[PDB]
Amino acid sequence: AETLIKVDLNQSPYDNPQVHNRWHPDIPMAVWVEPGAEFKLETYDWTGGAIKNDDSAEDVRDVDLSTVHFLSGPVGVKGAEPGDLLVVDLLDIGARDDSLWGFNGFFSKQNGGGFLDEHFPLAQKSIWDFHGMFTKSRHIPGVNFAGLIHPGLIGCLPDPKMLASWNERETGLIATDPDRIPGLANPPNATTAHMGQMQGEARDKAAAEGARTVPPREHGGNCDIKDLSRGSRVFFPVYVDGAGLSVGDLHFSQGDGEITFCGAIEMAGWVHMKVSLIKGGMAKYGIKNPIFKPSPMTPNYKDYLIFEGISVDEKGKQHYLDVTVAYRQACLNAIEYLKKFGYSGAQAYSLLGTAPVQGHISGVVDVPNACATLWLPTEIFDFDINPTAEGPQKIITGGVDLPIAQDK
Amino acid sequence: AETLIKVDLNQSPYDNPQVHNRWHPDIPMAVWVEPGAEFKLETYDWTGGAIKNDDSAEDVRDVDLSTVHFLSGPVGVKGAEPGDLLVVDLLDIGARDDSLWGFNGFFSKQNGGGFLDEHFPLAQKSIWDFHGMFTKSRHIPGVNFAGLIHPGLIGCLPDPKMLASWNERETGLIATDPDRIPGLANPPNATTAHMGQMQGEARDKAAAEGARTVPPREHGGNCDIKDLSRGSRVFFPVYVDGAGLSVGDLHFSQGDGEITFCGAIEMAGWVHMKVSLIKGGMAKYGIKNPIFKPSPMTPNYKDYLIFEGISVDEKGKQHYLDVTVAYRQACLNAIEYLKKFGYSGAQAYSLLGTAPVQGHISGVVDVPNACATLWLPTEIFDFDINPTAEGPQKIITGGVDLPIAQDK
Amino acid sequence: AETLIKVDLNQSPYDNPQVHNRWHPDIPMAVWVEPGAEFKLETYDWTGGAIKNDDSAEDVRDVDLSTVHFLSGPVGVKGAEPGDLLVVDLLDIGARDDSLWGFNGFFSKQNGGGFLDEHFPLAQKSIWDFHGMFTKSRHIPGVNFAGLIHPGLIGCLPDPKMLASWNERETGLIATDPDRIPGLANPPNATTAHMGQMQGEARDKAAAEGARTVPPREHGGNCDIKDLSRGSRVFFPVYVDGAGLSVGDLHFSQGDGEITFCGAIEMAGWVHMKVSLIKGGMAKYGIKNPIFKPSPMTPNYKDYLIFEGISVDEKGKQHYLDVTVAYRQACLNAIEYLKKFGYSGAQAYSLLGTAPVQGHISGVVDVPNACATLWLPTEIFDFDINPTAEGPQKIITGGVDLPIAQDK
Amino acid sequence: AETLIKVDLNQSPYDNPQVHNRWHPDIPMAVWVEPGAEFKLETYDWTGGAIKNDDSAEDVRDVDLSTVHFLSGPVGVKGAEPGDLLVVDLLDIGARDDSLWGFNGFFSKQNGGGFLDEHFPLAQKSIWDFHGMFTKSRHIPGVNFAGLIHPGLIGCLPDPKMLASWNERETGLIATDPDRIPGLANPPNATTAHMGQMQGEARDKAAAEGARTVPPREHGGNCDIKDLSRGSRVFFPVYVDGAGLSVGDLHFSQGDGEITFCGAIEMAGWVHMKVSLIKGGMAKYGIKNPIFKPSPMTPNYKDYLIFEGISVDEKGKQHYLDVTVAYRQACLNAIEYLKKFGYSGAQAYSLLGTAPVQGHISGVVDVPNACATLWLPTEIFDFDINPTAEGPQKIITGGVDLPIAQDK
Numbered sequence A, B, C, D: 001a002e003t004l005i006k007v008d009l010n011q012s013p014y015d016n017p018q019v020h021n022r023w024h025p026d027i028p029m030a031v032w033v034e035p036g037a038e039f040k041l042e043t044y045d046w047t048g049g050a051i052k053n054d055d056s057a058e059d060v061r062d063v064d065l066s067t068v069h070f071l072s073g074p075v076g077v078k079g080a081e082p083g084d085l086l087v088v089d090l091l092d093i094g095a096r097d098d099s100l101w102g103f104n105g106f107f108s109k110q111n112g113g114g115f116l117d118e119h120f121p122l123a124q125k126s127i128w129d130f131h132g133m134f135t136k137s138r139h140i141p142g143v144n145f146a147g148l149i150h151p152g153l154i155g156c157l158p159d160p161k162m163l164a165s166w167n168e169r170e171t172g173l174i175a176t177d178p179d180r181i182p183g184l185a186n187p188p189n190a191t192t193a194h195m196g197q198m199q200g201e202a203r204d205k206a207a208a209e210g211a212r213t214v215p216p217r218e219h220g221g222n223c224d225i226k227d228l229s230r231g232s233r234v235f236f237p238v239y240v241d242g243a244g245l246s247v248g249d250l251h252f253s254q255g256d257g258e259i260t261f262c263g264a265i266e267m268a269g270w271v272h273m274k275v276s277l278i279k280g281g282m283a284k285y286g287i288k289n290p291i292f293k294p295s296p297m298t299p300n301y302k303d304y305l306i307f308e309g310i311s312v313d314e315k316g317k318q319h320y321l322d323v324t325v326a327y328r329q330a331c332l333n334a335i336e337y338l339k340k341f342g343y344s345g346a347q348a349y350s351l352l353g354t355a356p357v358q359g360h361i362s363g364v365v366d367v368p369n370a371c372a373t374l375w376l377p378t379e380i381f382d383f384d385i386n387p388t389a390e391g392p393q394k395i396i397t398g399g400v401d402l403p404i405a406q407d408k
């Protein structure tokens, strides 16, 4: 299939007019296609080159998070009207031949944070090499797995209404605690905005009101749903004429929650897709957020070891039906378990961000506690991590660990 | 294997000395077994007979929720010491031959509430019949599925310290909003307490400080994890000598979250299990909450239709990394979708509480929005519910709906 | 549901009028049901009590194979006419509460033979205990698995024409080598025939022309398809009015090919089923043999170690597209591999007949060799049997083995 | 990873010195690698360009089957000695970017034949297009599936002894019926032999004794095991120093048996692989034929409709434990079923050769009949093919069919 958007990794994303990093109804289509068209799009990694394949974490700590995410699009679809559904088949996804590695990290609390930032406040990095379908890290010994390759971010352009709501409610929330490190949301920011085929005046009004791509919203966008993977079929709400489908933020793999924030195994690559329409889909099927069907080709792991958490935090304080706090406990429990086998806490945390662990909302009614589970697939280890009568052999030798960078 | 605790459904649970409905370190063992023992335990449904197989919801409206849950146990295991892990193999689980039906319901907001109680505030009920491995409801046409049969509630007796913490933090939370309908937690309550073989003054003492079985806690207890099912192996923390393992609240099936609160498909039944020990297991493996391995025998549904939600509520107000609010959105999206096929909202809500739907914590870092997904297995419908170019057809037409009871 | 055919294991099968052990159009219905009826049938093990739970193989050696199989039925279905399809839902299947064990064996070559009878010519036995969904044998250490519970034999009564063809072609084949040990087929035999409710001369006429139940045929019958298991839906061709569905020969588990001949794990038990009709199904769907849909509840083993064979026998002699010889080599390769871990050959051969191993007709065109594969699920062993750089380790300490009985 | 053997589809395979089409101990290594090396090999389709993407079957009719299969290799592995096992990870496999289509056909009975050549004696062809992970044919409407991408042929060079045995037993078998159309085996043939880098005199001899690659043998070779797919790990017996691993005959998909003979969906492509050794692997693990582990990434089809056959042929003749005849019956039964939905017999036959259907050796003991099953995954049709009460609707219209060529 022909590649309709090409990416040169050594060219600055700002120099590519078919790339953009904010959501706005007025970004012009990077290309137009007919319904039924099938084609490939190439993509920068989300940072657009900021993070390197080496053994230092300073890049993770110093990255300018206002730049993310560099998306390829918007793709225009002829005849697409507001209120349609845009049916997207993800026919395949992969890494570029010249870039067979990816990265996971923990941001510093001072520059982004993450799910377990109170336990791992310093920036770190693991590097992942791709071996066909499989991946592994020089930083995490004894671990090998097939990737669940997915776009972290995909979705259609918002209408004027939608964008106004997003900015209002999100700036409103920053207003309630504007000095929290890390912040509660990210406001529009024109300084580092890439607005596609835009320069001058229209570029500068739109860049000042253009939404950050950081959070998932009603249209889809940055959902980081690992299961929205190569082979899947997704149904997107359409808000503007021609839809304006963009995609980026490709992951070779990811755990549920993407707890590390900085991936997932983040990568540059390509997406091969087919597009079509359901006329008036949104009203016909009562669509608000996207809906999709998962892939018939995914890694078949099923020998899970499953960890539990409840809505009582690390300090012993009682919350109310809080799935977020319950998941944190399940993740911490899994980390504690892994450490008994010789993994550092950073190796374990990176693992939960990268390997295809499951996070279930098992119970959300048994007041006051929600119950959340974290499913660790045991197939990914080249030794048996199941409990036995005699106790764990502390297998993991070496002195290998994830790079760590002191704060600035 | 022999049944070590027998249950007569027509006998009041209070008259059975091997049953109890509060957690307390001093409830004496209902029976003693050797490590390696295999045996069966019979169980009351969680209410102990309050809910009937008929077409009215008044029993659900009027049930005395202080009575739940009637558990079978505690089972003493010889040589079990605090800090051990109790290894339980769930070898099989089923319904009683004389009781081949179960119930799902929504509590009234005035008497219990639930996940979608703002949308369905009146008490309702669906009745499920068991056909070998399979189930269906006269109240929900076109739906048939294999059950994922599991105990909703299982775990070991707390020590004195643990119980004190539970009461302290939970009464503390009630104190912050004591008149809230429904309540934030349930305090100890001696009026409806069944304390097993406890007699005299010690009984009345213990009943006044005995914790409700309603929430999951560090020991396990009422987790309502559907995947802790027949065929699973679970590892419980031991707090007192002999462990004191109790089990109840059997489910023929359940969806992730148990959003309906009143099940799941609640039933009476039996559990066939084997028990063993890992000496000093808790410290060896860094165990706080239980861990387990899921069953090799589960329903193989994989053709999911997957719905999404973010941390923005039904009023449009913006929350911060709130998985609970995101899941509500995903569930409501699923319900809206099913309605287009002719299901009532009540049918849809009941379905999500009963069928083995998956609830994933897909993303919990993309500030401000968490992303939660609800996975509806399409194999359970006897017609195709997948989106087509044509839009849906109302294949659900006709009479039956769930019983509904007006508020007292 | 109600049990329409009851079985007393201590009663001779000949004394039960609702049992039979030959196929004949004139055996009267054991019971009549309406289409849509759901009910249970109890069953003798195929031999009807000949094999015992002990540590000697003499019963296997001496069994009278003319007696097999004692089937429960024929069940009549009101309105069923020749050329219909009888739709049978297998809703559940299990062992009797008073008989929680089963048996596998190798027949002596002198009395039955088997797939590897040139390698294991003496009669042997392994006994299997049922632990809820799971099984294991005191004769084969280190192995545990969830059973794939299925009827080895199920199908409808032949019409007069069909029965005549069966006898003609099968006696014709015996004629080509009548003194062969073991025989090529089994002729009608009135001596040990149980003809249900048939009386007098009519009974006598039928027992002399009644087909042995030993081989699978166009109607179904003794297929020993492990995947025709609890949870399946099967569609049977109907030849006579009322259909006359019979069932027996229940297996707790079996490997593809049932290579040991004497099971499988043979057992007495029960089948819970629902029946219905497709009017004129046979012509509508071009049905000759039965067709079916496998169960949504089966053991999820996927970590196979897969062995190969080609159409060259143990003497090195070249055959032509012979899948039978190819599968023998694949089984023999699997046995040789297992022996390196400390299993006897008999243990391994019993294992392949009992555990849910897969046998695939991988290639049947690459003249002169067919390619057959044997898939051994590695999850059934409590130690890792995968190849490593170091080679195997004799982990099966020994002492215990299958009973063996010298020839008479 | 780097491509160590490159292929120009427009260059004659005879002009590529790193390709060969006969098995012989003396073909020199096309390249040498160290143990632990990972690399790519590109491949011709098995015919090397003979079959074209068009709507006529004459190329299939006229192809010179003495030329097949053009393999890439032999790959030398430093330190590999006879009696070792060569561990091969298949890390990924795909189609070439310039060649995103493949072909299935039936050979004429006069030039190759096939499993159902008595029913389809004239040469035919279906063409398949690749859409990322998925495939479909302009010749078979209503069918879409994810490919189970595998090498049909892979293995190591035989030693002198092995080669002598192969020729002796195979020429011996041709001797028993030398004029048979099609032949029972294919003898060595120097006319169309490509012997890699072998030269002049030494080569003219090797080409006269070099075995055809057509059948699977002890070393592996052309097994056409669909499940030996991308993601798999295979363990090959080593016969000569450096091993000499070759590979070709790549399939995008195939059904069990490869009944159509001419594929499978045959294609040109590439294989990304890693190699390593088990020193003395063959004796350590009692290896005769290869063994392998299937892939964690395969198409997840589960909703099978399963067809049966027994050892009684199309003429009604009775065979003895003949799996080959039983499989033919099961395949013919499946074809008859599909025709009721509007497919031609040719469409159905091509489908069974290409789609990932399963063929099980379900029973091989119930004298006189073997029982074989054919498993059609129903997910591959864009309409429901399951039996219902009112019968099949003839969905397949149009007038498209496979090209057919009259005999030469």
Ligand SMILES: [Zn+2]
Residues within 6 Å of the ligand: A152, A153, A222, A223, A224, A249
């Ligand atoms: Zn993302």
Ligand SMILES: [Zn+2]
Residues within 6 Å of the ligand: A046, A152, A249, A250, A251, A263, A264, A266
């Ligand atoms: Zn990302």
Ligand SMILES: [Zn+2]
Residues within 6 Å of the ligand: B152, B153, B222, B223, B224, B249
């Ligand atoms: Zn519960």
Ligand SMILES: [Zn+2]
Residues within 6 Å of the ligand: B046, B152, B249, B250, B251, B263, B264, B266
């Ligand atoms: Zn419950």
Ligand SMILES: [Zn+2]
Residues within 6 Å of the ligand: C152, C153, C222, C223, C224, C249
């Ligand atoms: Zn049988």
Ligand SMILES: [Zn+2]
Residues within 6 Å of the ligand: C046, C152, C249, C250, C251, C263, C264, C266
């Ligand atoms: Zn049997």
Ligand SMILES: [Zn+2]
Residues within 6 Å of the ligand: D152, D153, D222, D223, D224, D249
């Ligand atoms: Zn081949």
Ligand SMILES: [Zn+2]
Residues within 6 Å of the ligand: D046, D152, D249, D250, D251, D263, D264, D266
């Ligand atoms: Zn091929």
